[PDB]
Design a protein around this ligand. Structure first.
Ligand code: A1BYN
Length: 287
């Protein structure tokens, strides 16, 4: 009863990329200039073990099948000696951004980021897609006013039953740690941890506690603390994302509604000191 995935996998010529510089490691900053049409597109290029190909091709499959203003768009792959070509998000991952600009993030930007992440996550749930790695590090920043979800290296297309492997323990639900079960609601848990990272301006969840004890702590009933800038209204939303009963956690469509209400009066829900004074074509316009 599944629908045919008629997504298009675009294959680009290497002679069309101008690897400007290295963004990290390898991921490169560059330009994609399609032959003929006078257009330069700022892109990120993710550059031979047969496992690595099989996995980056799996990620290219997922990114080619999603199309949402809050999900990272795939432009294509290059079959050299395999490269992912994605939209360049010039302000980096949201985790490093809130850490850099701690003294400039207003309650407006925080609550709006929570709305946008829930929108992209709700879209992924519409596509019957479990992310399995939602975190502040995996949310990229196009502009301070526009963020998108990235990194689908663990994404799965539908509960999902994993069989093993390295996984980020402090972001995943209890059911994911004990039974390797992943659902859209286990993504809601990771959403709760991701909101906690933003409200704490990039603090590390369970900083110091070894990952092997996380399963014990959560079973005891202990959760992440209430961030200083958070009213009980916002912290209650995170707490609901951390219920043991997965179906008691809020839906992504509900998290959109809640944070949108808060985004209409941000200073009522986030208390931040000084909150008052805080031919190039982008990929989104090349269709
Ligand atoms: C989280 C860190 C970082 O974001 N650095 C960064 C990123 C970008 N833009 C950008 N656009 C699209 C894709 C990426 C990107 C994706 N990955 C993961 C993987 F698997 F490697 F593809 C990256 C890893 C490392 C770097 C970039 C990756 N990024 C950017 O645009 C100019 C700049 C930067 N920085 C160098 C800033 C460093 N941090 C944010 C302070």
């Amino acid at each position: 009863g599944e629908a045919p995935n008629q997504a298009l996998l675009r294959i680009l010529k290497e002679t069309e990329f101008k690897k400007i510089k290295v963004l990290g490691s390898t991921v490169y900053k560059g330009l994609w200039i399609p032959e003929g049409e006078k257009v330069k597109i700022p892109v990120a290029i993710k550059e031979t073990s047969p496992k690595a190909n099989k996995e980056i091709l799996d990620e290219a499959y997922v990114m080619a099948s999603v199309d949402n203003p809050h999900v990272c768009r795939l432009l294509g792959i290059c079959l050299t000696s395999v490269q992912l070509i994605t939209q360049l998000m010039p302000f980096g991952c949201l985790l490093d951004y809130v850490r850099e600009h701690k003294d400039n993030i207003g309650s407006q930007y925080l609550l709006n980021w929570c709305v946008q992440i829930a929108k992209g996550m709700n879209y992924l749930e519409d596509r019957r897609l479990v992310h399995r790695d939602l975190a502040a590090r995996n949310v990229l920043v196009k502009t301070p006013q526009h963020v998108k979800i990235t990194d689908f290296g663990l994404a799965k297309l539908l509960e999902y039953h994993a069989e093993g492997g390295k996984v980020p323990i402090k972001w995943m639900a209890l059911e994911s740690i004990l039974h390797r079960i992943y659902t859209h609601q286990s993504d809601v848990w990771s959403y709760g941890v991701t909101v906690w990272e933003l409200m704490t301006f990039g603090s590390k969840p369970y900083d110091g506690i070894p990952a092997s004890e996380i399963s014990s702590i959560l079973e005891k009933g202990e959760r992440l603390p209430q961030p200083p800038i958070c009213t009980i209204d916002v912290y209650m939303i995170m707490v609901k994302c951390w219920m043991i009963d997965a179906d008691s956690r809020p839906k992504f469509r509900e998290l959109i509604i809640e944070f949108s209400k808060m985004a209409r009066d941000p200073q009522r829900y986030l208390v931040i000191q000084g909150d008052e004074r805080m031919d190039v074509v982008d990929a989104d316009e090349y269709l």
